GROMACS .gro file of C-alpha atoms in nm:
model
  129
    1UNK     CA    1   0.746   0.460  -1.538
    2UNK     CA    2   0.956   0.091  -1.485
    3UNK     CA    3   1.283   0.135  -1.460
    4UNK     CA    4   1.545  -0.138  -1.494
    5UNK     CA    5   1.786  -0.230  -1.214
    6UNK     CA    6   2.084  -0.027  -1.291
    7UNK     CA    7   1.914   0.254  -1.434
    8UNK     CA    8   1.764   0.322  -1.113
    9UNK     CA    9   2.081   0.283  -0.921
   10UNK     CA   10   2.212   0.562  -1.159
   11UNK     CA   11   1.932   0.798  -1.109
   12UNK     CA   12   1.914   0.735  -0.753
   13UNK     CA   13   2.261   0.783  -0.732
   14UNK     CA   14   2.272   1.107  -0.943
   15UNK     CA   15   2.012   1.227  -0.710
   16UNK     CA   16   2.300   1.182  -0.364
   17UNK     CA   17   2.156   0.836  -0.217
   18UNK     CA   18   2.452   0.617  -0.278
   19UNK     CA   19   2.557   0.630   0.096
   20UNK     CA   20   2.328   0.911   0.208
   21UNK     CA   21   2.299   0.862   0.627
   22UNK     CA   22   2.529   0.558   0.583
   23UNK     CA   23   2.284   0.358   0.396
   24UNK     CA   24   2.505   0.215   0.025
   25UNK     CA   25   2.321   0.200  -0.292
   26UNK     CA   26   2.251  -0.111  -0.287
   27UNK     CA   27   1.998  -0.083   0.014
   28UNK     CA   28   1.753   0.204  -0.188
   29UNK     CA   29   1.772  -0.018  -0.482
   30UNK     CA   30   1.688  -0.346  -0.287
   31UNK     CA   31   1.433  -0.132  -0.123
   32UNK     CA   32   1.293  -0.024  -0.427
   33UNK     CA   33   1.265  -0.381  -0.563
   34UNK     CA   34   1.041  -0.513  -0.287
   35UNK     CA   35   0.839  -0.183  -0.225
   36UNK     CA   36   0.712  -0.120  -0.596
   37UNK     CA   37   0.912  -0.347  -0.782
   38UNK     CA   38   1.071  -0.061  -0.943
   39UNK     CA   39   0.732   0.080  -1.057
   40UNK     CA   40   0.653   0.451  -0.991
   41UNK     CA   41   0.292   0.415  -1.030
   42UNK     CA   42   0.268   0.169  -0.795
   43UNK     CA   43   0.004   0.247  -0.530
   44UNK     CA   44  -0.130   0.018  -0.216
   45UNK     CA   45  -0.402   0.094   0.051
   46UNK     CA   46  -0.329   0.004   0.404
   47UNK     CA   47  -0.614  -0.091   0.677
   48UNK     CA   48  -0.583   0.236   0.848
   49UNK     CA   49  -0.713   0.367   0.546
   50UNK     CA   50  -0.392   0.578   0.440
   51UNK     CA   51  -0.226   0.483   0.109
   52UNK     CA   52   0.135   0.407   0.020
   53UNK     CA   53   0.279   0.592  -0.303
   54UNK     CA   54   0.550   0.552  -0.580
   55UNK     CA   55   0.854   0.373  -0.626
   56UNK     CA   56   0.953   0.383  -0.249
   57UNK     CA   57   0.588   0.327  -0.124
   58UNK     CA   58   0.560   0.634   0.085
   59UNK     CA   59   0.300   0.648   0.319
   60UNK     CA   60   0.009   0.979   0.315
   61UNK     CA   61  -0.080   0.932   0.682
   62UNK     CA   62   0.253   1.159   0.775
   63UNK     CA   63   0.455   1.265   0.440
   64UNK     CA   64   0.246   1.349   0.189
   65UNK     CA   65  -0.120   1.487   0.134
   66UNK     CA   66  -0.397   1.268  -0.074
   67UNK     CA   67  -0.691   1.446   0.040
   68UNK     CA   68  -0.854   1.139   0.129
   69UNK     CA   69  -0.620   1.043   0.479
   70UNK     CA   70  -0.791   1.188   0.805
   71UNK     CA   71  -0.513   1.349   1.010
   72UNK     CA   72  -0.246   1.333   0.768
   73UNK     CA   73   0.091   1.577   0.845
   74UNK     CA   74   0.218   1.611   0.490
   75UNK     CA   75   0.554   1.622   0.628
   76UNK     CA   76   0.704   1.623   0.256
   77UNK     CA   77   0.456   1.921   0.183
   78UNK     CA   78   0.356   1.766  -0.159
   79UNK     CA   79   0.070   1.647  -0.312
   80UNK     CA   80   0.098   1.192  -0.307
   81UNK     CA   81   0.040   1.226  -0.674
   82UNK     CA   82   0.377   1.380  -0.734
   83UNK     CA   83   0.540   1.055  -0.620
   84UNK     CA   84   0.430   0.876  -0.888
   85UNK     CA   85   0.640   1.097  -1.148
   86UNK     CA   86   0.849   0.908  -1.393
   87UNK     CA   87   1.104   1.163  -1.244
   88UNK     CA   88   1.203   1.051  -0.897
   89UNK     CA   89   1.284   1.371  -0.809
   90UNK     CA   90   1.005   1.431  -0.523
   91UNK     CA   91   1.046   1.063  -0.404
   92UNK     CA   92   1.395   1.096  -0.355
   93UNK     CA   93   1.372   1.435  -0.131
   94UNK     CA   94   1.112   1.275   0.074
   95UNK     CA   95   1.291   0.928   0.126
   96UNK     CA   96   1.587   1.154   0.251
   97UNK     CA   97   1.355   1.280   0.556
   98UNK     CA   98   1.210   0.966   0.647
   99UNK     CA   99   1.546   0.805   0.676
  100UNK     CA  100   1.650   1.104   0.882
  101UNK     CA  101   1.346   1.069   1.141
  102UNK     CA  102   1.550   0.855   1.370
  103UNK     CA  103   1.418   0.492   1.247
  104UNK     CA  104   1.664   0.484   0.945
  105UNK     CA  105   1.529   0.242   0.670
  106UNK     CA  106   1.357   0.038   0.924
  107UNK     CA  107   1.065   0.279   0.832
  108UNK     CA  108   1.088   0.070   0.511
  109UNK     CA  109   0.915  -0.288   0.644
  110UNK     CA  110   1.020  -0.437   0.294
  111UNK     CA  111   1.373  -0.339   0.345
  112UNK     CA  112   1.364  -0.456   0.732
  113UNK     CA  113   1.223  -0.778   0.594
  114UNK     CA  114   1.405  -0.840   0.321
  115UNK     CA  115   1.726  -0.605   0.274
  116UNK     CA  116   1.847  -0.586   0.594
  117UNK     CA  117   2.128  -0.777   0.666
  118UNK     CA  118   2.164  -0.943   0.317
  119UNK     CA  119   2.407  -0.894   0.033
  120UNK     CA  120   2.272  -0.611  -0.093
  121UNK     CA  121   2.575  -0.509  -0.314
  122UNK     CA  122   2.443  -0.778  -0.506
  123UNK     CA  123   2.159  -0.522  -0.649
  124UNK     CA  124   2.400  -0.276  -0.788
  125UNK     CA  125   2.635  -0.536  -0.942
  126UNK     CA  126   2.713  -0.537  -1.322
  127UNK     CA  127   2.612  -0.170  -1.311
  128UNK     CA  128   2.813   0.132  -1.494
  129UNK     CA  129   2.816   0.363  -1.224
   0.00000   0.00000   0.00000
């Protein structure tokens, strides 16, 4: 499913992401925009052979099992395919563990490079939240 900007903001808020670990909602919507372009079905393979899955591009080397990443740790205990669902619950629950990992949202390279220190409030501007 391809989310609309405000539609995603509302689902993420309902799922407890607004200000989770200090990160306002705009940060999460900005990250999804640049990670997957709001598409739950997005996948991207990396050079190390792992693959990124879903709306938040969660990596198969540490967080989910895709059955083809040798040495995967599956920290969120879910098959990576669960992360491509139109229901974002699995992606959100796993993202909460990732952001609590000690590096915060820097775990997402697109957030670090394109959202960090920008006016992220613009991403939820105009939305009925």
